[PDB]
Symmetry: D2
Subunit: 280 residues, 4 copies
Amino acid sequence: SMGEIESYCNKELGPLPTKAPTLSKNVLDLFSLKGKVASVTGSSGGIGWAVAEAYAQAGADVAIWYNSHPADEKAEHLQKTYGVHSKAYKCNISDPKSVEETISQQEKDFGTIDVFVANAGVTWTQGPEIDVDNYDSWNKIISVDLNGVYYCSHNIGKIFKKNGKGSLIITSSISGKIVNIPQLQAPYNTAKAACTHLAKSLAIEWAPFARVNTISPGYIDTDITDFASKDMKAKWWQLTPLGREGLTQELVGGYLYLASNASTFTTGSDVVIDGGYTCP
Amino acid sequence: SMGEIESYCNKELGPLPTKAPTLSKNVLDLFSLKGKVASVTGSSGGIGWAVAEAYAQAGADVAIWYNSHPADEKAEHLQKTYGVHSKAYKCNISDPKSVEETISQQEKDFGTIDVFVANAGVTWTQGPEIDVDNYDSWNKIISVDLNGVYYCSHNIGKIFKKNGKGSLIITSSISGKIVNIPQLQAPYNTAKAACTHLAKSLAIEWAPFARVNTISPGYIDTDITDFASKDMKAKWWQLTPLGREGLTQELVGGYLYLASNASTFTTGSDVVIDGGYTCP
Amino acid sequence: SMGEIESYCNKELGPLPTKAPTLSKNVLDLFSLKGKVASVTGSSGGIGWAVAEAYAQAGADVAIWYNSHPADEKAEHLQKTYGVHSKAYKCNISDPKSVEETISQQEKDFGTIDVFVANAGVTWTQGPEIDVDNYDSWNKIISVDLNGVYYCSHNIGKIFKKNGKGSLIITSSISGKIVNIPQLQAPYNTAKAACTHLAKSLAIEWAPFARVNTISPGYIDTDITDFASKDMKAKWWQLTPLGREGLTQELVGGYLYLASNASTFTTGSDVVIDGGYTCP
Amino acid sequence: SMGEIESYCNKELGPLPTKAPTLSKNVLDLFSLKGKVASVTGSSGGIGWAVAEAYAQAGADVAIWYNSHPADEKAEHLQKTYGVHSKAYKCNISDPKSVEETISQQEKDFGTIDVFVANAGVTWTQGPEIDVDNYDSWNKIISVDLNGVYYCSHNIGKIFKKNGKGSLIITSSISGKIVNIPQLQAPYNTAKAACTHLAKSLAIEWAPFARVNTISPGYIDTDITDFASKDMKAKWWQLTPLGREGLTQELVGGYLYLASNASTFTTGSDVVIDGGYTCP
Ligand SMILES: NC(=O)c1ccc[n+]([C@@H]2O[C@H](COP(=O)([O-])OP(=O)(O)OC[C@H]3O[C@@H](n4cnc5c(N)ncnc54)[C@H](OP(=O)(O)O)[C@@H]3O)[C@@H](O)[C@H]2O)c1
Ligand SMILES: NC(=O)c1ccc[n+]([C@@H]2O[C@H](COP(=O)([O-])OP(=O)(O)OC[C@H]3O[C@@H](n4cnc5c(N)ncnc54)[C@H](OP(=O)(O)O)[C@@H]3O)[C@@H](O)[C@H]2O)c1
Ligand SMILES: NC(=O)c1ccc[n+]([C@@H]2O[C@H](COP(=O)([O-])OP(=O)(O)OC[C@H]3O[C@@H](n4cnc5c(N)ncnc54)[C@H](OP(=O)(O)O)[C@@H]3O)[C@@H](O)[C@H]2O)c1
Ligand SMILES: NC(=O)c1ccc[n+]([C@@H]2O[C@H](COP(=O)([O-])OP(=O)(O)OC[C@H]3O[C@@H](n4cnc5c(N)ncnc54)[C@H](OP(=O)(O)O)[C@@H]3O)[C@@H](O)[C@H]2O)c1
Ligand SMILES: CCOC(=O)CC(=O)CCl
Ligand SMILES: CCOC(=O)CC(=O)CCl
Ligand SMILES: CCOC(=O)CC(=O)CCl
Ligand SMILES: CCOC(=O)CC(=O)CCl
């Protein structure tokens, strides 16, 4: 009207400046997720399972996801070792309607969702793209890595808007900032940069209620990278300052930092747990 | 075998170092495109038409592209004002098979293609993405902006490999590096950031024969941006160091520099003709 | 010799792959700094004091630094509220010899240093640089913001190498990635980008023993930004997705995450706690 | 007053939008530098001499610079092979007063300066920085590479402001975006990132009259890189997608593009002629 300031990025923020949130006084009590539901996508893999366990260790009602590797002993293992409500859902991230059904079924069994981690995807292991004459492997990467992240984010955002709070954590890769040297995977790099910039784009629109960030890792030692020839894996160590492959336990710290109240001002950022690979 | 060096990025480069190309002595003679065919995608718009004319002015057999705005007087205008062979093709960039037909029909009427400019796309003008409940506008952006660029690049590369020379120029946007402040277009930013990294990824694989670059512009004064409300267009000038909107004649210099022999060492780069918008 | 791999970045890493560190199983126990000394530079200001308190809250022997605002009641307040050994040192960060004396006097009163935070600097508040005709304000910024960070890093590194472990945290600013729009501070932006890239450069060299990272913040509400006119401060909110100014308690989470064992794989990264300012 | 728009970046732009410049119709006539003076710093080396010759070939009154390698046959060679007024000046770029004397002596013998290229610097060839115990090699790099660029760009700006037109081209390196893998040069990388971000920072302040850009090259084949051991030079080819070292004739195209009217909208950008080194 008159005398108030209106934002240039998102006009729905209201009369600026927006009131700052109330934060604890002890630093260690900021990272606690007590009384929060954390739906982690692809929580039946290498990085997803570690993040789900780390969120459960912080007292969170984690929701497990799987597609073809049934994970119901994983959900039960978190409901008896830490006493946090958990469940396992079978969803095809590439199916627009299945994602909606699987997320509306999580806001009902848990009451609400306060933390989301879009951490599902597949890798391109077909060599240079100029050798494949069928647009079926490219279409698959863009369907699970990029389109799936949008399907998950478009539905979870609706839950955050009504609640007015939330935190989305897209799991891109260093392929969204560099090009993998030994292997030639252009479709994979293209999809991960798309997710990395989509996380930033949603931050401006979700600023009023939620937050969006990225946890782009490096060459973590999961079931994804444990197929490459030792000759290929030898060129990864030679180009990593730390000179090794990160473990799944070296990522939980970054994932729990962007989901808790500790990162109450980090919006649309990119935490690069790469071991220094993107620096050279 | 022994004594020779093999590249870490692309093993097909051969025994390193690769021999440097032969370049003219006069700088002004490096920018000439005499005896070269330059197929410019979407050459019936604002930026495509200017680039096609600029390539024709440099003595190049430019090929015009259009989808729904017939451009045959444009192709004829370039065949009588500069004396360079030209033609117009109707292709749906979002159709995987139509692109193949339209590119194989250009390698036959011109003999070869030496310069390609994937410069076709559509903008997202639906406001914040959390308000559209149908994945039909998102699917369209990812089909014309991202998938179209891959269809154009996957076919043109097959022509460069046989010839051993070429230059691809993907026309991404500053949306691949920033988020447009006043308007909220997440699907558009995601698609352009995808192309900006696909160009880099293809540079590693096309290193042996061709080169790939990006001409990410700012807020150029074309038919794309001549619909936004003056209130929206007023926030673009306020956040641009140069404090105005660039013209289509201020982009041809960057397009002719990455297509000619002047940029014989610029591979996988990103020339940002934005007026300084990404700096603030 | 033969059969072992030697790194391309730093040849002192040894025969790759380097053995991964031993990490706790509970995520919340990774962030604990028990039995660690954390020397925080400029710990008598706005961000330095908060980081020192947060490190003390995590059970660390924090060392306070000051130049002209005596901080000895701050050091005592941390030695009686948390029971962690602490002390205050008066050092001129711009004096090469004083830094050496003040760091050597900290490795003696504490036994060792396990965490360092180069978080001292001054701001450029003289308007556009083309109006000052004396190279005395530019020389001051490059002496405290950039040269001081090198003096601190060149001496602290000599302690990490002997111990074989450590973590350096340079506090750059978003000015190392963008240009502050309303105010015109070129010397300040130049110095902060220098620190931001120096942190990355030292990561490759300190890879064998220590780690180096950056905590580039946004427009935090400290004594540095509480002088700008409300007209200037009104343009900061309008260009921040979160639409406000961050608090000093919203930065401790990032500082404690890059100093503890949680970030045991984050080397040469850049955690941007800006509220989304660098996104648009 | 009322109805006009005032910029957020630089309030001296005037009532927005700023009128666009008048540009030729033929693309090849945009790159011509006829009737322009182009003072190229460090024009007695590898890249400086090539840029000076390329500017002279485009019809420009180039001014040669040297410190310890007298270059007066180079200036005379450009005044008899192309018929363009030229002269040679001996200046110590690290001396604040000498730069002022050498630039005021160039605005007098040529009438004005329309193009400046701050392209003087030295490289760090002392190995890892943790082995040198004297802050004299670090102080030299920050004096010639960073401070020298500010001295050159602080006096030239005063000439552009009175004329209202100009173009500054700082010659940073890929070291301002990456860390050189085989060699360990932290002081050099720190100084080049400083120059790269200073070019962007000056773009916002010089928007009203002049333009500032960067020509960050890769591993060009000049006298600077023709000392490294073939073992070191072998790791440069292996990590360069193009798999070779660029020549000084592959940079002139980029330097003439950012100095002429072709890049009349490229302000505060960064043209990376690296051969694809920064992509991996
Ligand atoms: N080093 C690395 O592996 C690395 C690098 C950086 C980033 N990332 C990214 O991190 C994510 C996690 O990788 P990871 O280590 O967990 O690999 P992983 O062991 O292969 O697990 C991938 C996860 O994604 C799920 N998933 C795959 N395709 C799916 C589909 N079509 N529909 C639904 N769920 C699907 C898998 O479920 P099921 O197994 O149950 O089918 C599993 O939970 C991936 O997006 C990967 O790109 C990892
Ligand atoms: N300021 C800006 O506009 C701006 C900013 C940065 C980047 N860009 C990018 O520059 C490119 C060109 O935009 P412009 O300025 O030329 O806008 P334009 O005047 O709307 O022209 C767009 C061009 O793309 C073609 N095209 C659109 N959809 C197509 C489809 N489905 N199949 C085939 N061709 C299709 C159009 O052909 P028809 O008209 O014949 O259908 C036309 O040639 C776009 O990719 C845009 O993203 C421009
Ligand atoms: N919003 C922000 O303020 C912001 C933005 C991003 C980054 N930063 C950076 O964060 C750092 C901390 O700033 P701040 O928030 O703590 O404000 P501040 O209180 O002004 O910080 C300056 C701190 O450094 C010390 N210091 C200053 N000049 C010194 C010198 N010449 N020698 C030794 N110590 C010196 C001061 O100690 P004394 O007061 O005791 O002299 C004080 O502890 C600065 O480097 C700033 O550039 C802050
Ligand atoms: N591959 C590369 O070499 C490479 C990589 C990227 C960027 N660069 C940068 O490009 C610039 C040019 O290097 P170059 O290829 O021309 O090699 P160079 O011949 O060694 O370049 C140095 C140039 O600057 C002058 N110069 C050096 N120190 C000076 C000082 N203290 N005062 C005044 N003038 C001084 C030299 O003049 P005198 O010889 O007459 O003293 C010479 O013209 C450097 O800044 C370099 O960092 C080059
Ligand atoms: C061997 C193929 O493995 C990969 O795709 C590696 C990554 O995901 C790195 Cl982001
Ligand atoms: C008003 C919508 O117009 C746009 O989308 C503008 C651009 O393309 C900038 Cl890249
Ligand atoms: C008003 C001057 O205040 C500043 O310098 C602000 C910052 O440090 C932002 Cl990094
Ligand atoms: C062997 C030392 O040579 C260098 O410093 C190389 C460069 O300047 C690359 Cl930017």
